[PDB]
């Protein structure tokens, strides 16, 4: 078979945005196999070696002012520029979550399942309530799942000792909706 | 923080393969076909709102290769340590009999970025409707990847996502069947 050793090289330019395009930080990083050797943190202003292996480059590139000048301005020419290029279909993109509530095929006690799927952005909030009041304890989530197609999903269960008349509400709040989405379970 | 746009790229020997792509909060905006030399968008729509001079990515890839040779050489030809993929198989939305759905094979936390993935229906490989993504960056510098299989939920059917990767001692098969 194929047993030849592999040698990888990665390069990542990371544009980090805080409060829209207000404050911006550019993180340029070089990675040899699974190790970052050199980098440039716009907040630092120059290249810094992450390991001795990257020392030659940090020293070399830092000796070229034209370069350093271009990098320092990348927060604007690169980061901000690209942010605005796709702000309409990325920052502003919104897709309402599909919410449904049903008992799990597991579980005495009844394990309720709140399924929130196909939503975007990824930031979301789902809390359980019992007769109009939060359910701090008992909750258990699957975590935010990034489907890879610009769509997320997540399961958030609630352990309960159901009593006739009880109303267990799963509340979801998400950028795609102004007022929260709710789904009750009548006991 | 609020958002992150990453321009992740790589060159790998001796497979002589490379990648060049942009990423928004974990999702691929687009990547350049190293061969056809043209921008391919994760979603069709994007291509209608922005553009990218795909041709220019290859220039970076040449520089990437050279650098690789340099690093490989000064590291005393220290090869990459294989890291096996964590594999998970989920549905796009809660499964329901005969209600169309999609199988998502989540191959994550691995490296180098070379892998063979195959979908299986009752012991046999499926091709129709399958689609996959390129390698996605991770903060730990390993990779993520997704393969997709559109299907019609049943009770009889048993699927598998067959993942091959140097870091695995043997092909990993992820079992998935209707349990609802």
């Amino acid at each position: 078979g194929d047993t030849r050793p592999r040698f990888l090289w990665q390069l990542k330019f990371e544009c980090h945005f805080f409060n829209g395009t207000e404050r911006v930080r550019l993180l340029e990083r070089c990675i040899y196999n699974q190790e970052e050797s050199v980098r440039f943190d716009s907040d630092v202003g120059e290249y810094r070696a992450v390991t001795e292996l990257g020392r030659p480059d940090a020293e070399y590139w830092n000796s070229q002012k034209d370069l350093l000048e271009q990098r320092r301005a990348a927060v604007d020419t690169y980061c901000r520029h690209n942010y605005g290029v796709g702000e309409s279909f990325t920052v502003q993109r919104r897709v309402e979550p599909k919410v449904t509530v049903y008992p799990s095929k597991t579980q005495h006690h009844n394990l309720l399942v709140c399924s929130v799927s196909g939503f975007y952005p990824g930031s979301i909030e789902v809390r359980w309530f019992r007769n109009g009041q939060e359910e701090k304890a008992g909750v258990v989530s699957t975590g935010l799942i990034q489907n890879g197609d610009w769509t997320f999903q997540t399961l958030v269960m609630l352990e309960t000792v159901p009593r006739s008349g009880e109303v267990y509400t799963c509340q979801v709040e998400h950028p795609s909706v102004t007022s929260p989405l709710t789904v009750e379970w009548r006991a | 923080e609020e958002h992150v746009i990453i321009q992740a790229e790589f060159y790998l020997n001796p497979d002589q393969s490379g990648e060049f792509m942009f990423d928004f909060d974990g999702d691929e905006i687009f990547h350049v076909d190293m061969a056809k030399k043209e921008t391919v968008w994760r979603l069709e729509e994007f291509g209608r709102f922005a553009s990218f001079e795909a041709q220019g990515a290859l220039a970076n890839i040449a520089v990437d290769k050279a650098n690789l040779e340099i690093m490989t050489k000064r590291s005393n030809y220290t090869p990459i340590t294989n890291v096996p993929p964590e594999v998970t198989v989920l549905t796009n939305s809660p499964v329901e009999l005969r209600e169309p759905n999609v199988l998502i094979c989540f191959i994550d936390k691995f490296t180098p970025p070379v892998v063979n993935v195959t979908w299986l229906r009752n012991g046999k490989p499926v091709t129709t409707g399958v689609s996959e993504t390129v390698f996605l960056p991770r903060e730990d510098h390993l990779f993520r990847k997704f393969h997709y299989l559109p299907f019609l939920p049943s009770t009889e059917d048993v699927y598998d996502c067959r993942v091959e990767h140097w870091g695995l001692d043997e092909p990993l098969l992820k079992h998935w069947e209707f349990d609802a």
Partner: peptide, 13 residues
Amino acid sequence: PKYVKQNTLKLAT
């Protein structure tokens, strides 16, 4: 709107 890339720098030789 056109996306712009950062150019890859050559390593110290």
